[PDB]
């Protein structure tokens, strides 16, 4: 409350470690369908039923730009990323295997770098 304030946890290198995470995903052989935006002209059904789109190289321009204002936000978009995916694709297609593998490939690195 008003002057009354826990411990400053260190968040000066948060910048840093989350652009390695994001190299890490980016380089992933399973990280295909999540590189680029889906083409809202050419997927039908896509522009209606996924009211946020995200993809890796929309995080990689908001994480260089100063769009992120702390850690919390940059995991709720790599999130959202899995979450429109399993929306959108069965569990049993590449794609939807490949958005489980890349979501437990992700949470792995959040807790060992962060908690």
């Not at 039908?44 to 993809?55: L, N, T």
Request: hydrophobic letters at 35%; one cysteine or more; glycine letters at 4%.
């Amino acid at each position: 409350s008003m002057s009354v304030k826990k411990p400053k946890r260190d968040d000066s290198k948060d910048l840093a470690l989350c652009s390695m995470i994001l190299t890490e995903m980016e380089t992933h052989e399973d990280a295909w369908p999540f590189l680029l935006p889906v083409n809202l002209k050419l997927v039908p059904g896509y522009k209606k039923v996924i009211k946020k789109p995200m993809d890796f190289s929309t995080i990689r321009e908001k994480l260089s730009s100063g769009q992120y204002p702390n850690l919390e936000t940059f995991a709720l978009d790599v999130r959202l990323v899995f979450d429109n995916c399993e929306t959108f694709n069965e569990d049993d297609s590449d794609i939807g295997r490949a958005g489980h593998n890349m979501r437990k490939y992700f949470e792995k690195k959040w807790t060992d770098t962060f908690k």
